[PDB]
Design a protein around this ligand. Structure first.
Ligand code: NA
Ligand code: NA
Ligand code: NA
Lengths: 594, 594, 594
């Protein structure tokens, strides 16, 4: 059979007849070439016509069926890694079939089958104006009946290019990788670019999943039209999962108004070490009761740390909501080490600039620590705040940040009336001066709430801003109790108003407050120790006060310290070297229970 | 020789006769197929019987000898990476021989030979009830005489499964990867699961080693029995080494009582960016003089940062100890950005809940910075503390954390009597309210020590807790000197006790203290400026005090501020508009040297 | 043609005649062995003589031309990854030609051609005493006319060894990887060792580039001679780029004086999670107007976070400078979570020890947040400071750090006279005690500036140091305005000087200041309420003061609180139970406008 031998060698079984032993090692396995080649697999092993002849990829070739066949086949052997080869662009031009069809899926991923994308995957214009999810991990059109996707990793130096196609309708959805009910899945190194999509990657489904991660990926120009309803680049919807060391960039005007880089929706999730530019928002951090089926109705242990961002709206948005039968709770959050700015834009030209936003009764948000962050907004941006507190809050703690923007705490008057509890603004927060002189008519801490309880505001200025109406103001509609409100005197000598309580709330039994004020006093005419009394009777709530002014006089001195009287006068004991009625104006620190 | 040609091609030298040139490039090397296949190596190249026929792996096959032969052979050529193939489970069923036998080793690692684990490595029931170290980098049963393991990396998407086997005796030890005297070794991406082990990975030996790292690994259910004496998932025992972006999970009740995620035992080590659930402890940070031979007797530059944890005992434990000839020192530690909770459990049902624990004379621990962390414990967990300070401390500094648990500083009375120096609790630490109303009979800062020197405690409440006995208490057995202790007045108006010095320690020459108190005063009957004096004589130590109460009276006012007299009365000058002896009760801020 | 068949099989086209189908799958592509082998490429495919025979690498073989041919060829097919094989050392012994020749380049990198370095690349002694850049991404000797290098990644477990060769002249330059105008390029996992170089890696060119990263690399002993002018291991000169999780080590005495680990020179750059030992400096953070052509004249969003360092000079150095036509600005910087020490060395034996250094009119540096860091210097190191403020500063904010060194704020007298604005030193900075008793003749905050405005210094001691001349001192040459300067009383009772204003600057209209002082007072002889007046007349600027001393007297008490008089006396109302002139010395807290 020498003719048969040559034909076998030239046949597809040929490599299975050529023997091999590793490095001529007589202790190694006696193999055939085919066995060694079978240790790897690429798209080339499936990218063939029905007669087995390889097809070159290109804009006129739908690679979908070939990629699916490769995934299917490797799955059947218990898994492996399929290379998508460098130096080629592989186009996708049709929808997939079966369980992914309900999900507008293109490729169905399978457990233990990894994709090493080194070349480029592009969408063909078949998808213009249509929905799609490029890779889908569900195995059923009903996700509630889907099996899991496990141990599926997408990685490499390659690219997923969405073709630039706009959305056809705002009700459509588009995704890159919908991992599904995903356990130990990841995407690493991939660039996702040029699209109009809802998400690039979604991890999990309604809390179902674990240990899913997006690392060292790039996301570039993924919103490009006015049709696109909403965008969150990575959507984390399973626990013990997160995003780290990624890069996010947008250039579209639309992105400034609708795009968020990350949403965290389940417990023990994180967003670290990433850089964002051109987005509306940094991260949504939420527990929606609608997605509580997999991991519970609490989102807790949520970390947003060490990120760099230029955004046009709000850095971190906190929220929760409820269903008719399920209640969401958000607690145990840390936001730390982030360096964030509002990009150059006109005032009011994008959603309100904020480092933290509490968005819209329902909210159950508490135990949030905001520490060691920097925030800046250019001086023209009136709509910029350390916190826009627009809905109920049950706790948030700010320590050792540096906030350089128009407001510290803001809510718009006559909009929402939030109930606030456990808002803590430590004195170690540094208030920048970029907006000094821009604050005519404005309150630095504008406390436009229904009520404030168990809260601390310790205002410390670091430069003058005499333009502002006040440092902190409480409208008469805001109840205030069991709270501590202080204004440090530095840089406040020339301010007409420091703290303003429009309903005289500072008189509350459990309100602890100190702020500077100018007070007119008159003494009796007695030589020697002599009392000085305030002309006004607005000080019934004052427990003590003390001088912030020098005494220009030789012949007498006002009291250093004052207490009050039943009629609301302040009273203190000064000294008349020579007698006579004295009249002075003095800057005092007014104190109540502090 | 045409018969010889066909036989050669079918022989194991066949591939060495089929020529190849890369992509038909006439400028490329004229090679044989075998040369290209020899650029890679897998377990298949060694997993053969004595006649060279490949053996399929499975539960009835001991893969150990084959894996060892592959490692040995690649080592002999100066290194490489051996793939452990996907889609198969490779069982290990015997101990190795030679230098690793003293270490109960299964596989001996070798320098420059990396393992790319894509499939699964499982332990066979041969190992039930026995000790083992699955991969061992020592080359000698005496580690002091061992050569080094250098440049050995274990990585991939695969799994090491310990088979679920319990320990046979609590004196046994079990490990996944014992790298040995390890320099530039790492484990990346691997899942370690289903066991009862002492460690999953140990880096270094008695300080010997460098540049060893565990990254993006998972560790799941590695304690499962009551026999297991102790567990630390990763044990870092060489410098310039650490753990980052890993996931640790336990489900066993035993793990809650004995398992720690990481121990750091040498200088310039770190534990970052990781998530822990179900463990007793987060990290031990220590310098044991017994392990000082490789890198010295100082552990310094130790970082525990940006981790997420649910634990049942103590997050970070600090310690050192000594040998008859060597003294260990621990200094220069940072703990920051961590978000930690005590999981749901009954009070006292696990080791005492703590964010920092100083464990058991000997201790030389100092220069520790604890900053920007969040800690929570459910309201029922009586045994929860920001710090359990149970042994001598020479310094620890707490700045800008948020601690929401039962105690801030605790030590059990009549147990240890620690000597405390340089404990600094900055005012920027926020004290949560979850345990409000639960503190009957308890002191928030319970200073159960032999002595306290050069320490600062600045207590700032953020809500009321009238259940507590005091904010801070010093028993008479605790010496207090050269210290600053302050209680801010906010939320304290209704407290009977704020700071308690049971030995009147606040009278010390170099004690700086301020806290609120209620004081009864009586005046002389003089009209005009008139003195008011305290009825009690307990105020000889007071340097000044000032009013925290309003004055309900028209006809007189008490002094705003007071000093003292030799007999221990307070005294101040008030004002009698009309004469008469006055008697009042007032809330004062008592101050000593502040 | 059976003779022809055997000859074809033995020829370099042989593999192109042996058929293959993946795993015998009749649905797979009918391929040839050569097609599968062509899916990978290594240096072996090009490392051949002119007759196609492979050449073994070694010290007598210049591998350069072969590596270049491989890169060239893969480039021609649109990219790929070339393996540099493990188990071999590949020597480079000549310069490259063409566009890289102007750059003293050895290898020209090309777009989309990645290098997987598993073996070792060594420099041959041809390069002793000469300049070189081992890998160069420019395609033109004039970088301004160069095309870009895109999508070029160098990775693996291998090594680049510079051969130990010293520089021949201090004007020479040497680099490992000069990526050029580099977009999406990276180096991961590589060890760079044994050299005398200017840099190991430079990312970008004059701001041109994006998305370039150095991750998990090691840099060991890269300065070794007195000839070497300057060294920065990684130089980041394109935006959206950075360094993470690397290790840097030097052992040379020269490195202590000239080597920096990282320079960041463009916006949105970072240096995270790394460990440094033996270097002079940690990171330079700068915007040099000379490099503003690619990315603008602002460096903003600059992060230095979570690093471990032992250095001999300055951790972070901030700067900017200008050109005749372009002005550089540095703003929006965060330095956080770092644990840094000055290594063991004699005082003044290396560049001045500092955590932050502001280096040398020109500087426009502002919005810098320094938070949550630890810094230590041994007690002998006189030249150690939290900040050496040696040039103009427009803002820097310090919150919640722990600084344990000789000075907090320093500048040498009669050197530079910096103009300082917006320097904020929050009270939450903890000042360590290691240098207690070492500060004879020294001011802890030594304010040797031309002027200080809009600045806050809140000094809080945590132990005594009676050796120091003062806590803070302003020479009369330093203007001080619109500033807040406070010294907390704790541990200061025994200090002769607390805050010193040598030009009486504390009297400024907008200066807010409080510090302790000892004051002698005398009373009138009146029984009853009686005034006490200071003997000295140095207190015209004081707004209030209060007692920090107890009253040892029964028969009288001095005032608790004081104001002042026009003549500069303090005055207060005390109480004479029995008449008589009183004379006392008291410790007061002096306050101005606070
Ligand atoms: Na209301
Ligand atoms: Na004692
Ligand atoms: Na001057």
């Amino acid at each position: 059979d020498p003719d048969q031998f040559r034909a076998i060698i030239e046949s597809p079984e040929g490599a299975g007849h050529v023997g091999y032993q590793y490095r001529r090692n007589t202790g190694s396995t006696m193999r055939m070439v085919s066995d060694v080649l079978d240790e790897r697999v690429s798209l080339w092993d499936f990218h063939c016509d029905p007669s087995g002849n390889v097809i070159q990829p290109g804009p006129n070739v739908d690679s979908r069926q070939y990629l699916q066949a490769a995934i299917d086949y490797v799955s059947s052997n218990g898994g492996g890694t399929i290379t998508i080869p460098a130096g080629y662009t592989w186009y996708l031009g049709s929808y997939g079939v079966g369980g992914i069809a309900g999900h507008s899926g293109i490729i169905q991923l399978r457990s233990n089958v990894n994709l090493n994308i080194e070349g480029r995957i592009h969408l063909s214009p078949f998808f213009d104006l249509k929905p799609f999810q490029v890779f889908v991990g569900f195995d059923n059109g009903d996700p509630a009946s889907s099996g899991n996707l496990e141990n599926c990793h997408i990685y490499g130096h390659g690219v997923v290019d969405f073709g630039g196609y706009e959305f056809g309708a705002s009700s459509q959805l588009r995704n890159g990788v919908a991992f599904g009910r995903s356990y130990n899945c990841s995407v690493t190194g991939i660039t996702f670019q040029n699209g109009d999509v809802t998400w690039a990657i979604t991890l999990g489904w309604n809390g179902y999943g674990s240990n899913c991660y997006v690392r060292k990926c790039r996301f570039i120009n993924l919103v490009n039209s006015s049709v696109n309803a909403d965008h969150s680049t990575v959507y984390v919807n399973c626990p013990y999962s997160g995003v780290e060391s990624c890069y996010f960039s947008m250039s579209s005007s639309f992105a400034r108004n609708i795009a968020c880089s990350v949403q965290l929706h389940q417990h023990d999730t994180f967003y670290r070490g990433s850089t964002v530019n051109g987005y509306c928002r940094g991260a949504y951090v939420v527990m929606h009761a609608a997605e509580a089926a997999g991991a519970g109705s609490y989102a807790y242990n949520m970390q947003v740390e060490n990120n760099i961002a230029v955004i046009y709206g709000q850095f971190v948005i906190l929220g929760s909501d409820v269903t008719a039968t399920v209640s969401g709770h958000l607690n145990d959050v840390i936001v730390s080490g982030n360096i964030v700015s509002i990009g150059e834009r006109a005032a009011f030209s994008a959603p309100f600039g904020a480092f933290i936003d509490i968005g819209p009764n329902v909210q159950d948000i508490q135990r949030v620590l905001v520490t060691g962050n920097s925030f800046y907004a250019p001086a023209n941006i009136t709509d910029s705040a350390a916190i826009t507190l627009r809905a109920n809050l049950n706790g948030c703690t700010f320590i050792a940040n540096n906030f350089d923007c128009r407001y510290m705490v803001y809510n718009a008057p006559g909009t929402t009336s939030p109930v606030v509890q456990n808002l803590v603004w430590d004195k170690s927060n540094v208030i920048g001066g970029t907006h000094a002189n821009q604050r005519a008519g404005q309150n630095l801490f504008d406390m436009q709430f229904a009520s404030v309880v168990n809260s601390t505001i310790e205002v410390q200025l670091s430069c003058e801003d005499l333009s502002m109406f006040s440092c902190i103001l409480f409208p008469a509609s805001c109840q205030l109790s069991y709270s501590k409100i202080t204004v440090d005197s530095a840089w406040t000598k020339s301010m007409s108003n420091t703290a303003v309580f429009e309903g005289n709330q500072q008189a509350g039994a459990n309100v602890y407050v100190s702020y500077p004020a100018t007070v007119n006093l008159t003494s009796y005419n007695t030589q020697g120790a002599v009392p000085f009394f305030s002309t006004d009777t607005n000080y019934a709530w004052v427990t003590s006060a003390y001088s912030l002014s020098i005494n220009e006089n030789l012949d007498f001195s006002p009291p250093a310290t004052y207490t009050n009287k039943a009629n609301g006068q302040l009273v203190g004991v000064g000294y008349n070297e020579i007698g006579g009625v004295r009249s002075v104006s003095v800057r005092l620190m007014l104190q109540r229970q502090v």
